Amino acid sequence: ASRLLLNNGAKMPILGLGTWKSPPGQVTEAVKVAIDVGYRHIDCAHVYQNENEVGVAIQEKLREQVVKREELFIVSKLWCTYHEKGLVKGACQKTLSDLKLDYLDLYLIHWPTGFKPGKEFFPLDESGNVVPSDTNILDTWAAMEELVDEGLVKAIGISNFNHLQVEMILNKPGLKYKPAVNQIECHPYLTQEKLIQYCQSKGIVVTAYSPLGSPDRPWAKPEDPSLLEDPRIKAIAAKHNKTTAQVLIRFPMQRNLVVIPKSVTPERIAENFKVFDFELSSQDMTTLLSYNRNWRVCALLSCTSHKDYPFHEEF
């Protein structure tokens, strides 16, 4: 509808605002505008290095009595350098301190790969390989469950897990909480049908990231594929008298996914919200699904030999 139910009974807004690459100097105004426009879900992470500034916006709007806390669905994520069981609570509390909140709605394992603990987000050796840590997804999951038990987070989940990694959590001895959500890259050029079918079949809500193809990702080249400029998608938009962004946001919604487009531009933040008053046809949905090229925006070559690297599997 406009929300999907999670395994804890919470209603997750199907549309949220993404914050990766939203600079600290611009993000506060972006989140204020988004809340005004009607977004009730913000996707955050410690590695985005902007949680303080998102927190400022949230507090402004709570103080303005625009929203109360219970009407917001705030997501953040545990960065790769904090997979050690003993570091998880501190990481969560730092995020909470930065966001100026007392709890998160959802806290995710950001990637299945643990990285060497320390002050660098991407610890590299002298040949530029990311340095891994002696951590594993099951032990980290156990530490995530403690956060629920402690009341710091309402729901926990995973991000960028392949179907075997999801399976490993579900099959964990002594599992206490099933993951609520798996947040994965999803757009017409990477449709993920098998992994979505798997996750949904298992009662895990899927959130689609990079739904516009992340045209501002820092490793994009001007010649790379571009969803917003794909003339085939432009045609589908024109037929509905919508923008290509609206089509791209609507597409995951009709697959029963949560979607989290990012913008720091007020006009676009508003534009991107106007997706609840039209429907893509069956033909439109099939056509968009047929553009799948297994083209992935978010992967790092410097991690491909990690034991937990998620993208060697078919799904």
Ligand SMILES: NC(=O)c1ccc[n+]([C@@H]2O[C@H](COP(=O)([O-])OP(=O)(O)OC[C@H]3O[C@@H](n4cnc5c(N)ncnc54)[C@H](OP(=O)(O)O)[C@@H]3O)[C@@H](O)[C@H]2O)c1
């Ligand atoms: N879990 C993970 O590992 C992971 C990985 C990637 C992303 N994510 C999450 O998913 C969110 C969304 O993915 P993303 O940031 O990679 O990219 P995205 O949402 O696919 O694309 C954002 C880009 O599209 C532009 N844009 C947005 N609305 C527009 C519109 N209506 N017209 C034209 N251009 C438009 C933005 O420009 P402006 O901002 O300048 O307006 C920005 O350059 C992230 O911010 C983050 O919250 C999670």
Ligand SMILES: O=C(O)Cc1nn(Cc2nc3cc(C(F)(F)F)ccc3s2)c(=O)c2cscc12
């Ligand atoms: O992690 C995000 O949400 C987006 C993101 N994505 N990436 C690309 C990444 N790919 C991976 C791949 C892995 C893995 F699991 F495949 F090894 C782990 C961490 C990363 S981060 C970045 O380099 C980066 C710098 S700040 C935010 C990012």
